[PDB]
């Protein structure tokens, strides 16, 4: 259901994801990898929010930044655009 109402964020999302898929079109492994990372983070965040309160996630924002950083070498540009999405943590 979301909460936002600005169609600009959506456009930016597709542009970024498309940029990665195109930049790494040669190696589908990298693309699938990044996706799996985000998916895992989602399941973890939801689990915590569904656990009520008493729960310790194994994958957080900082953890994701570290993993994505190691997998994305010499490509700080993408890692930056990705970090921008993350709020003030």
């Amino acid at each position: 259901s979301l909460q936002n109402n600005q169609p600009v964020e959506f456009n930016h999302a597709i542009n970024y994801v498309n940029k990665i898929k195109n930049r790494f079109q040669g190696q589908p492994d990298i693309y699938k990898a990044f996706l799996e990372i985000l998916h895992t983070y989602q399941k973890e965040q939801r689990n915590a929010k569904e656990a009520g309160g008493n729960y310790t996630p194994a994958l957080t924002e900082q953890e994701v930044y570290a993993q994505v950083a190691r997998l994305f070498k010499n490509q700080e540009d993408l890692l930056s655009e990705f970090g921008q999405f993350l709020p003030d943590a």
Binding site: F10, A13, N18, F85
Partner: peptide
């Protein structure tokens, strides 16, 4: 929520 869930739906959209 706009940080990860957004990019998730986007990828799932273009993909299928």
């Amino acid at each position: 929520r706009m940080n990860i869930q957004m990019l998730l739906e986007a990828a799932d959209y273009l993909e299928r």
